[PDB]
């Protein structure tokens, strides 16, 4: 995880394309902040140019220490001046004539520095981080120089300059044009994601300028970049015009007079005759940090102020621990600490926010673009007697895969709780019809969620959560199970049985592997048998199961043992009651499958699905059906169709965001933990870290399946966990005694393993076993 | 105002570039070539709309030119045309003859040979970009006038391709000023790209792609001029492949190079694009052929009973702009055709062309910053920014706090969770029921029905579990009829000029005023813990005005008993009948209140529940199990909020929405005045509600119903029934232009009923 200060403005320098004025619009910035009259010891300005091609013959910060040498002369200031190239090729450092000696990437490092240092007077740090020989394109020098520097390291070595120098500013300048690759082949706009600075944008003065500056532009706020500016040389076309009135004056644009065309000019005038308009500019990007934080600094106290937050109680909420969210990229929140030292910090969304997260950064930018598309195609249309690609796309592709084998409906409406209401509906017609045409009411497991409208609250069992202080109106219509459940303890897999059960042989009851849990040899045993008598027994007119396959999410991260449901839903279709799968947790790899039909080995006649449906980006929820479910409501009347609506039903935006997240996720290429037979995620929790934490004292139990890891504590333990990840760079959120960690579907073995060992240096601080 | 037809039986392209001088022109001829030059039917349609440089520039002429060359190189005889439309006076000075007509053509017919034909719509002198030409030149087109130019011209062309060859970059300024590609959005025409093989190239590609991307455009194909950097291989990258990168080999630096031997060697790589364009347009038309048959097979619409659904009338929509869908229709000789959302699309309808490109920049912003993050505890610029603007707008002057879930029906739900609780704090701590008007309608899901009142619609056939937990009163209503508005009562009970009479104050020391109060006071006094309604206007039951005398009454006499009052202005809010609120219309506040639908404009669902400080603290306690304990996964999604902040400014600014004035609180009239009183006086109408963007009229009782959806259908206006009622719902920035031409329309229809 990133740590940036933000104490100080640092800005990235953005360019429509090659040859605009990139470095003299630095070095103009950097002039007007140095040499400033109310000279300060205090002021230093910081210049970065991690990549550079072309390298010695042209050096960015060469020119920048170089210029600023003459301005401070010419305007008769005196500044203190470095230039310094940490790394470059082997080629490049040939040319300095160093004979450096060669990494394992190609890259050489440098003692290449040169100071011209004045006590007490304004400082000028300019760095280059890598350079390469070629005066080509990064992507093309890399492979001809033989000399990579992998993305990552490039954001460190960025964050590390930044640590140690931080009145002050600092400036980033960018490579070639907004969309061109870096050294690694990444787009130079996606390279820098991670850190989402705040940017300007070196705009195009000639003609084809209009065009391209507006392109660049897009491209930025395209993957979340915010600009202060846009400026570009004058050619006499009156470019601003069109761009000011494009940019609706939300953001200046402003005109550099022409630059000499004499290839022999100092442009020390140009630099004087350019400083008004260079002073806007550093006016313009200093006033933006301060507006930013201004903001930030104030966001806490007023959301406590403004929000009604759901299912918290705000009495015991303090500004203190409402956390300041600026952004997501992929699995990491950036968060703005002021209490830190003003600060952005990478934090794992490990409460998957509310289990719907599911996009790496790469995901998480293609979608933007695919939504972006979607809204300017289609916006909202009317869905019902309607067809649009992208919700019929949708639909083919649920069918052809969640519904594989049963389905032939897709329902479409707006979240999960409303996908469970209509799926009530379709079970009770359903029923009535196979049944004559009276009071009807639900068969389900007690603790299984359902979602908090008041039908989908009905199917859930009374509890605290559901007395008269929450719903007047609530009257809990059904039977409701308690539960048989499966854990891991100690190394091995467990069989919990409610008092209600027989009792059962210590014999029976233990599991080698979590996969003997699932296997369907288990139909042959006396538990099954067990299981069998016990619901037959048990079984107004139950007129629809419906159950949370495998896990219940909500009601503590439970493993239901699978062969209970699996038998308990026979008994039901055996009695000709419809079975419904609620689906909206475990749906779209939440559990290492497209669907649990894989997991529990038998399938329903009705299913909902959300959260992971749509990748984490948007709401909309699906209620699919068996063709004798959509039967049950064909007739002349429209009195007898299924009348439940919301206005936005299959908006294309959700539509069109599933249908994208569907695809990805299960496709090989595209999700690196996609197994080689298509069906099943590799295992993403670190086998042995496991164990150690499910052997661990404090630890009741622990259930691990595809992309989620819970322990239940034996609470102080759990409200400490909490605060403890969270120093961490961990964010999760409570369920009483339970604590979990949710990736996403595509998320790396590699950062889960991160993930598990944080968690389990905390668990050896309240003890050591 | 019209909406255009466009034929989509044979291929029509957009020519796109990246910058200028990239090749544009030779590429357009290359294609050209390809197609025409195959070893009668055959005809190459290819079109300049905007030319700046002429005489001097004209890539009509070099077109035609070079295929004339081709031809004679090739071997193959054909005809060739071609032809420039109009030009500015300085331009026609030139040729030697504030835009001109030019009957200049240059023909060269072989017969029975394959055609081609080439157009210049309209061409400037100065060789400069067309917003600067048409200023210097004083010569102006329109965006409507070339949009029409080129309808006009491939109706009348239409084995058969044409190519529309755009005017410098993807986002240049047009001779108006407006962006190329916003330009020609309302056609929304594939295209290709023709990307930048130099230095510096790769992004500017990408940049241009995206923009078109970002408008809705779809690309079959990139294609470069080859200078050595390999830019091809960055580029499928990052496309992943999906759209084929074509490079064209090095052009002839000699400036007096034929350029024929280039055309020649390029030949393959043209007819690779030419395939691309016309296998795209194929498979296109075979999905869109084939979309409705299998809506009606995998599809479960919501609120249809699918066996009296039939192929023939599942709608095909391929794209919206704005307030008019793009409809594809086989039987017609497939064509898109351009209809309008006079449903507004399940009442949710409201962004003009221009905002709704405006808000798609917006969303994919909002999605690349934040995708969804966590809401409760959390605070995240667009979510707190749309609470700022909602509790400064539509909650000024009552609300203290919001409360995010995801559409309508949930909203209410938590509505009445707050309102009972405020009543149960307010009567120490036993059965609860709402009060409300019979007819209203306040959504789908199981609470939402509670407080709606017993009818077909409720029994035990759609929801088993519905037990009408209401006491549910008869509602006056007005409307206007024969010139004039009118009250009725209901039988438990027993006219104005202007509806502006009817919202006025004075009406509280009026007749009625009394009457009602003795009415509501009876009836009111298990417990009524909860006051829901729909003001001014019950929108689901068939859009009746209700009295807002009579509302206002109701409110009072409810506030009155401590009991809640939840205003639901899911249907009423941000700017459906003319102002952000009903509060200005009612002119009384409530303690609770839901809106959706148009808080969004249009996009993307969002909820939104405002409440009272006291409201709220009835909440506040020491136990979590006091708390709320009512929320969704996406609750506050930054993608709905980023939208609806957006909106709630745009809608309200006047200069975004040309209906506001400056004092700000009202829309201007939308309605045309007379063809209102004309609607109004016909012997079909029973009545008729016209306020803000709603004109609705039900219909004497239908026969006449059923007909005037399919008549408005063929009129280019889509609309959807409510029994008797037919409705006109444009969104809060529609100009009255618009409006007036659906109400002469709909005039029109009802005439051929009776003349009278
Ligand atoms: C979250 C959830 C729901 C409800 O979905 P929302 O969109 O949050 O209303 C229903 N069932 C299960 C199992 C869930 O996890
Ligand atoms: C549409 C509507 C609702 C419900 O909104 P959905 O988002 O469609 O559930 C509630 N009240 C009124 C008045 C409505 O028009
Ligand atoms: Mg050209």
Redesign the interface.
């Given at each position: 995880p990133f740590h940036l200060p933000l104490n100080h403005p640092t800005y990235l320098i953005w360019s429509?394309?090659?040859?605009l004025g990139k470095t003299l619009v630095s070095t103009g910035i950097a002039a007007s902040f140095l040499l400033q009259q109310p000279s300060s010891s205090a002021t230093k300005l910081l210049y970065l140019k991690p990549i550079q091609t072309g390298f010695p013959s042209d050096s960015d910060s060469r020119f920048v220490f170089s210029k600023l040498d003459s301005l401070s002369l010419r305007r008769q200031i005196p500044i203190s001046i470095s230039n310094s190239v940490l790394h470059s090729s082997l080629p490049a450092a040939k040319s300095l004539g160093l004979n450096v000696e060669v990494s394992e990437s190609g890259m050489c490092s440098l003692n290449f520095r040169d100071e011209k240092t004045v006590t007490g007077a304004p400082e000028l740090l300019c760095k280059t981080l890598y350079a390469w020989e070629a005066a080509?394109?990064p992507?093309?020098a890399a492979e001809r120089e033989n000399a990579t520097v992998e993305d990552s390291v490039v954001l460190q070595m960025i964050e590390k300059c930044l640590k140690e120098e931080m009145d002050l500013l600092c400036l980033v300048e960018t490579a070639?044009?907004?969309?061109?690759?870096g050294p690694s082949?990444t787009?130079?706009c996606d390279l820098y994601r991670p850190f989402?600075l705040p940017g300007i944008l070196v705009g195009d003065g000639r003609?084809?300028g209009?065009?391209?500056t507006?392109?660049?532009y897009?491209?930025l706020?395209?993957?979340?970049y915010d600009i202060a500016a846009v400026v570009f040389e004058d050619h006499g076309?009156?470019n601003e015009v069109?761009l000011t009135?494009?940019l609706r004056n939300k953001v200046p644009v402003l005109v550099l007079p022409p630059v000499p065309k004499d290839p022999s000019d100092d442009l020390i005038e140009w630099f004087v005759e350019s400083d008004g308009v260079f002073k806007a500019l550093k006016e313009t990007m200093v006033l933006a940090n301060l507006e930013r934080l201004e903001?930030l600094n104030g966001?806490?106290k007023?959301?406590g102020e403004?929000?009604?937050?759901?299912?918290?109680?705000?009495?015991?909420?303090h500004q203190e621990?409402?956390?300041?969210?600026?952004?997501?990229c992929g699995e990491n929140?950036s968060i703005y600490k002021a209490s830190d030292n003003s600060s952005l910090s990478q934090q794992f969304?490990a409460?998957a926010?509310?289990?719907?997260?599911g996009?790496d950064p790469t995901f998480?930018?293609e979608?933007?673009?695919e939504?972006?598309?979607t809204?300017?195609?289609?916006?909202?249309?009317?869905?019902?007697?309607?067809?649009?690609?992208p919700?019929?796309k949708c639909?083919?592709l649920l069918?052809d895969g969640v519904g594989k084998g049963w389905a032939?409906?897709?329902?479409?409406?707006?979240?999960?709780?409303?996908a469970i209401?209509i799926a009530?509906?379709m079970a009770?017609?359903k029923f009535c019809v196979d049944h004559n045409f009276?009071?009807?009411k639900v068969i389900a497991l007690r603790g299984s969620y359902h979602?908090?409208?008041?039908?989908?609250m009905?199917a859930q069992a009374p509890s605290?959560?559901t007395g008269?202080?929450?719903?007047?109106?609530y009257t809990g219509?059904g039977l409701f199970l308690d539960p048989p459940t499966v854990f891991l303890s100690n190394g091995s897999w467990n069989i919990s049985l409610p008092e209600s059960f027989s009792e059962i042989a210590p014999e029976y009851g233990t599991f080698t592997s979590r996969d003997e849990i699932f296997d369907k040899s288990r139909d042959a045993s006396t538990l099954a048998r067990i299981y069998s008598a016990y619901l037959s027994k048990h079984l107004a007119h139950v007129?629809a199961l419906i159950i949370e396959p495998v896990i219940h999410g909500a009601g503590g991260m439970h493993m239901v043992d699978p062969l209970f449901q699996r038998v308990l839903v026979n008994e039901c279709r055996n009695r000709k009651i419809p079975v419904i799968f609620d689906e909206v947790f475990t749906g779209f790899w939440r559990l290492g499958v497209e669907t649990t039909t894989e997991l529990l080995g038998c399938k329903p006649d009705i299913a909902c699905f959300?959260?992971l449906l749509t990748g984490?980006?948007?709401?909309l929820a699906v209620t699919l059906?068996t063709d004798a479910v959509?039967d049950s409501?064909?007739?002349?009347?429209?009195?007898?169709?299924?009348?439940?609506?919301?206005?936005?039903?299959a908006?294309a935006?959700?539509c069109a965001t599933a249908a994208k997240a569907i695809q990805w996720f299960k496709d090989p290429e595209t999700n690196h933990n996609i197994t080689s037979q298509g069906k099943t995620l590799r295992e993403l929790w670190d086998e042995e870290l496991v164990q150690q934490i499910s052997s661990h004292s404090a630890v009741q139990r622990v259930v691990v399946i595809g992309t989620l890891f819970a322990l239940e504590l034996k609470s102080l333990y759990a409200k400490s966990l909490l605060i403890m990840l969270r120093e961490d760079g961990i964010?999760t959120?409570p369920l009483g005694n339970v604590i979990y960690l949710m990736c996403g579907p595509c998320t790396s073995p590699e950062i889960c393993r991160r993930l598990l060992t944080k968690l389990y240096k905390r668990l050896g601080e309240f003890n050591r076993t």
């Open positions: 429509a394309n090659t040859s080509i394109s992507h093309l070639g044009g907004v969309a061109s690759p082949g787009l130079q989402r003609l084809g209009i065009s391209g507006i392109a660049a897009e491209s706020k395209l993957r979340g076309l009156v069109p009135s494009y903001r966001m806490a007023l959301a403004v929000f009604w937050w759901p299912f918290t109680q705000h009495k015991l909420v621990t409402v956390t300041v969210i600026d952004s997501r929140f969304d409460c926010s509310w289990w719907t997260q996009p998480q930018a979608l933007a673009r939504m972006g598309y809204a300017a195609r289609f916006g909202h249309v009317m869905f019902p007697e309607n067809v649009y690609e919700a019929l639909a083919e069918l032939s409906r897709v329902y479409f409406s707006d979240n999960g709780s409303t209401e009530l509906k009770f017609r009276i009071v009807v979602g908090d409208t008041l039908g989908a009905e605290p959560y008269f202080l929450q719903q007047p109106w219509r007129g959300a959260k984490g980006m948007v709401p059906a959509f409501f064909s007739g002349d009347s429209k009195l007898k169709a299924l009348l439940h609506g919301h206005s936005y039903s908006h935006m959700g964010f959120r």
